[PDB]
Subunit: 100 residues, 7 copies
């Protein structure tokens, strides 16, 4: 399953982030990708990233949720700090892990 | 069939959503993708996602429809809550399942 | 032929729809794709979709045409209801079927 | 040859159309593609499309030319009727046919 | 070599054209591609196209150059007639032919 | 591992850079890519680049960090000198190296 | 190595150019590609292109540098003559050549 997991990680492991504190946001695609990857690095739990190398989990199953909030310190960098984000494979990996 | 089902799930399984309560919507592509995946996670029935892993269905056949509505709580996030959505694989998978 | 037909279905089976009642239309690509799939589900005849699963046809050959009109109920949703649409494989599939 | 021809018509059989009667034209990419396929269906001679199924030609060789004009009736639909169009496959397939 | 030549022809044989007589030019991508193919058909010498079918050349080697000028009659069509153009295969195929 | 490392280097070795000293920045995609390449060359340590040719590291493991600052002299070229940059594979390669 | 070198030349041998004498530059992507190819043809040393055909080099190793300045005569064509340009394979091929 871990091999299939790394196929998912390479192909479709993407998250999408939009700012919360204040609907156009006047951010370009480069800024959007930068914010997404920053929130992936800081907000998403390390289990999501480390799962495909693997193939204590009792707390891990309930640890990760679908939608997340990250207070990424890009104030004066993108104009916002609080960002709400989501990623489609959250529930997919949750079901996989409940099966796994 | 289930292998074919996960093929369609990987390649062409996207839904499209547009707001209802009030034609430009001044929403960028990132916002559109975020709304699409949010409504896919919330509005779309779990059978649509879980079909390719399997390969009680009597109510499940009539459960889903082509066009759906999601009242996704993204106020001050994208500016709208009610979103009308559709995806091409709705009727396709309905026909496949009636055959299946 | 039916395998070839589903090849054209997956790769190049695309239709394009433009509003009729009143040349920019101030519609984004997401709205265009939504209208395309909506009219594909509604206006396009079920034979066009169901041809590659088979592989009464006397009425089917003259049933469909190249250009179509759909009065899709997207008023206050996209701003127009009447849409004229066309798709390239219409005449191609008509020729195939006349051969087939 | 005909197999090669079907390869080209899948990959590079694209025509481009621009309106004649009156340099921005304020037409979106969807409208451009719609006009392209419309004029391809109406203006381009059936020999160009039907060549890869074959593999009387004396008139066919001089029948088609590189650039074409189509008076496609999309007035109040895209804003123009007369369109000048061209595709790179015209002279290439003419040379192929002269060889063939 | 001719097989390799037709490989570069299918993948990378693209030319770029810009108008001369008078830096934004307010031409869309469709118009740019149309001008590119028009000047490719007109300005570029038939050796560039016909090389990969082959595999008198003494003057033919010095015939073509990297950049070209073409006065394509697209007045009231794109707004300019004189276009300076260049393609990536010019010096590459010149070296290939000097070797060949 | 080093072969896999060069697979990542070819596929997904990308960085994103945003200006620091003062949220739109009115920089095009070409300028964004140029800034990314500059800061990838000057800010990213040579070990990140040279890892896939190898396959003293005690200081090298703690040498690099996820987010970096790059002070590149493109003033009057893109309008800014200080940029903050990040790349996806920083943590992945740090974990790989710690395992390695 | 030369086979690998021509793989890089086909895939990722691209350069980026921005004007120097005077941050938006109001140049479209077609103009950007045209400027890039012009400067690649004139500025980049013939060794960079001719390396994958071979596979006197003592001066060649120090001959080229990563960033270049090229004074391309497209005044009244794109609005600028002086351009600073870069290409990603500079340091990579310099290391390869020092090894080779």
């Amino acid at each position: 399953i871990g091999v299939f997991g790394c196929t998912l990680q390479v192909m479709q492991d993407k998250i999408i982030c939009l700012p919360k504190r204040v609907l156009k946001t006047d951010l370009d695609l480069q800024q959007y990708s930068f914010i997404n990857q920053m929130c992936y690095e800081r907000a998403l739990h390390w289990y999501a990233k480390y799962f495909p190398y693997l193939v204590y989990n009792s707390a891990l199953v309930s640890k990760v949720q679908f939608t997340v909030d990250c207070n990424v310190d890009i104030q004066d960098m993108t104009g916002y700090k609080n960002f709400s984000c989501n990623h489609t494979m959250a529930h997919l990996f949750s079901k996989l892990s409940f099966c796994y």
